[PDB]
Design a protein around this ligand. Structure first.
Ligand SMILES: Nc1nc2c(ncn2[C@@H]2O[C@H](COP(=O)(O)OP(=O)(O)NP(=O)(O)O)[C@@H](O)[C@H]2O)c(=O)[nH]1
Ligand SMILES: [Mg+2]
Ligand SMILES: [Mg+2]
Ligand SMILES: [Mg+2]
Ligand SMILES: [Mg+2]
Ligand SMILES: [Mg+2]
Ligand SMILES: [Mg+2]
Ligand SMILES: [Mg+2]
Ligand SMILES: [Mg+2]
Ligand SMILES: [Mg+2]
Ligand SMILES: [Mg+2]
Ligand SMILES: [Mg+2]
Ligand SMILES: [Mg+2]
Ligand SMILES: [Mg+2]
Length: 311
RNA sequence: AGACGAGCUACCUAAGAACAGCUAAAAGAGCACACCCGUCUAUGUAGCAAAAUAGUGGGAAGAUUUAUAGGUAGAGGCGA
RNA sequence: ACUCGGCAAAUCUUACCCCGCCUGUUUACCAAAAACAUCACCUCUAGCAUCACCAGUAUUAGAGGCACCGCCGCUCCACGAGGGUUCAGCUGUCUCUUACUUUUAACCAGUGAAAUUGACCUGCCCGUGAAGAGGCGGGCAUAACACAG
RNA sequence: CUAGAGUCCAUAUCAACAAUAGGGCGACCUCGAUGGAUCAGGACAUCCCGAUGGUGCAGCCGCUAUUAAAGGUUCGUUUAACGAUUAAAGUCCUACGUGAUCUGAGUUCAGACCGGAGUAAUCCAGGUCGGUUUCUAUCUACUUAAAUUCCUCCCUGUACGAAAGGACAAGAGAAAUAAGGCCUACUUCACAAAGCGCCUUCCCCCGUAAAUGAUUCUCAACUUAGUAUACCCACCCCACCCAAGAACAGGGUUUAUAUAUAUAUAUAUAUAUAUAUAUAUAUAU
């Protein structure tokens, strides 16, 4: 297939509105009433999508790494993954499944130990523990809070959860998630880096749904996700869409998808005789459905940081 | 404290009436008149009107709409 | 590309998220919804005649909570003048307004209101002042007079 | 002020501890109705254009200073960030400058939900959805000639520079904006109006640089440099027409545990009752 993805003329797709800048401002102010920091990140991109603006700005507190969405990620190289964070500077890495509440029960005992091996300073007399949840948008921060309440507090959903970026607009109030020990969680908006270090990282972030797909163009990551499937040699889309065989031509794949689902759109094409309205297969609809199917997990586990892991 | 009010409206009782056409199927079904309602915009703001007009909208065989007579009265009635 | 917003107008498009099962109902006159009712499910009380319950009798009746179905607190169809986003098209929304028609409009003839009104022979600049001056101080301007903005 | 940076070196620029000047918490008036659009007036403490000193100014770029407010100071995404540009995308005052010109939010309201507090009713400088002020103008005030900038070319690949590089001044072409007009074509359209179309657009700026020269560019006597015109102007009218016009005016008209198969047995325990010497026994759950 294609040895490498063409990145000529493409820039990173940043998304830093004011709703997260004001939210990021609150974290510096609200740092006084927190004990531990938990960073929730997607397991599909354990290394690339992390926001550097969470270390030198917040800092000063124990840091816990929680890797969500294990079902959508391939954990064959799991041991090599944690070895990388250990070299990178992270000691506590936990994989979790928020939609199923897997491995969530081990968060609380480790969080208590991390706070114990620390200095609460003015919060020494507080029996209550306050934990702040951080990460990029759409990684399951709100789902993590609800999962902890269901497992420990045995209560209902307390934070709104959606499949769209920017569900949690601002820093919510403290929400109890457990009784033994008595401890709350702070729901915070997802914060992206104002400047993405590499174009490939931006596409990876767009692949997992952390950023809006429309501002990047549904076609560019349809090919990119098709490119990654070919690299992994999974070919889960071949039998899902009833395609004849694995292909690399992005336009032809979307043509089959539009044919398969009977989606057609009429567009204006600039000809030498003027503008002509013709009906064509609905490529944006095909791209959106193809992207949604991968996100739902019907195309198998993926790992977007395999190349950076090997070197 | 003592009288007067359910001819508006909330609800109930008695016995009445209305719902073209098309698709469908024996549907608190769909499109869509009559009819009921009042989402949005504009006009109006001592106005036609102490809540209206134009366009655009929801419902429109049902927990539908509606005429007549009767009942529940203020420390109360009635209230999806 | 206007804009808080594709509001309006043109055109007669697709997809996604949040919330509410759907359906229906309400603040007559600033809220039609995520609010309420709602089938379904759960809790409590009652062993019984002659105006309600009821001319009924535990598979019944009354008082409530939740809001169908399904799974072991969570998903799923369908639907919504509900709140956000998007594809294509569409257009004076805009770049950037222009032209024409009708009504108001102005003049002529008739009829003829309302708020308002301490008295007025009712100018500008700077300063002053119960601290924001047509009316006070120092300068300047200054025949009278109606109509349309 | 001259410690200290700037290889040396206070004063090309930066700057310590200090000092001297200037700028816009109180309850004094009113408790008898903020953002953007449009239009902008003004200050200079000048973002761009201009003139002139210094430079760690070779030339191009730069830094700093003096003078100058006539002219100009973009379009987009989200709710300041960066996207592309520009000679530049200035700091402010003007009751948010301006809501009897208009229009998002907030100060908040009648409905509701989530998180939190409260026995409750009900609340929250947490988040979210929805959500009505109107006006006929009386008075004051007002309601029709001088242009700027960018780019390209020539000078010139010249001066300067070892090269890398790369200008001034004068002149020419083209473009944009702004002001004032127009309909021959294009276009919206048709006896016409209009732009997307076309035409015209003209003065200086005084910071300093220097001669001579006394008690040396001179708050000494003195010399030099940069130290306006155009437009408008005469005075039948009934009626009709008009490129003139609101009217008027204007122009045109040639229970727990163990065992046996939920039951049974055993032990231990607790509850209750009785009897006997707090203790012991019996019965049952
Ligand atoms: N398949 C799968 N889906 C998951 C998992 N965890 C979360 N999701 C889903 O992914 C979506 C994103 O979760 P969410 O908690 O809303 O993320 P968020 O951090 O709150 N996003 P934001 O910062 O914008 O508020 C939700 O629809 C959630 O159900 C997982 O492990 N697997
Ligand atoms: Mg969230
Ligand atoms: Mg019919
Ligand atoms: Mg029906
Ligand atoms: Mg509405
Ligand atoms: Mg826009
Ligand atoms: Mg509309
Ligand atoms: Mg309805
Ligand atoms: Mg109402
Ligand atoms: Mg409800
Ligand atoms: Mg008259
Ligand atoms: Mg100056
Ligand atoms: Mg005003
Ligand atoms: Mg003009």
């Amino acid at each position: 297939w294609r040895e490498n993805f063409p990145l000529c003329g493409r820039d990173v797709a940043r998304w830093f509105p004011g709703h997260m800048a004001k939210g990021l401002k609150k974290m510096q102010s609200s740092l006084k009433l927190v004990d531990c920091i938990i960073e929730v990140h997607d397991a599909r991109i354990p290394l690339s999508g992390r926001n550097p603006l969470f270390q030198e700005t917040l800092g000063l507190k124990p840091h816990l790494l929680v890797l969500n969405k294990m079902d959508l990620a391939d954990l064959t190289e799991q041991q090599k993954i944690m070895q990388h964070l250990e070299g990178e500077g992270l000691k506590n890495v936990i994989f979790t499944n928020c939609v199923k509440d897997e491995n969530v029960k081990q968060i609380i005992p480790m969080v208590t130990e991390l706070i114990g091996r620390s200095h609460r300073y003015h919060r020494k007399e507080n029996l209550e523990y306050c934990i702040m949840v951080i990460g990029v948008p759409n990684v399951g921060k709100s789902s993590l809070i609800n999962s902890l309440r269901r497992q420990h507090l045995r209560k209902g959903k307390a934070t709104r959860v959606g499949g769209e970026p920017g569900i949690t607009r601002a820093v919510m109030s403290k929400i109890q998630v457990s009784e033994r020990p008595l401890m709350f969680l702070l729901d915070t908006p997802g914060v992206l880096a104002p400047r993405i270090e590499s174009v490939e990282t931006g596409l990876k972030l767009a692949l997992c749904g952390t950023v809006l797909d429309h501002l990047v163009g549904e076609e560019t990551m349809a090919d990119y996700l098709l490119y990654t499937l070919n690299k992994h040699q999974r070919f889960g889309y071949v039998q899902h869409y009833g395609l004849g065989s694995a292909c690399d031509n992005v336009e032809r794949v979307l043509k089959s998808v539009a044919v398969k689902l009977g989606k057609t759109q009429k567009v204006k094409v600039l000809t030498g005789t003027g503008n002509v309205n013709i009906i064509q297969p609905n490529y944006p609809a095909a791209a959106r459905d193809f992207l949604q199917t991968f996100r739902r997990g019907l195309l198998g586990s993926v790992m977007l940081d395999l190349d950076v892991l090997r070197g």
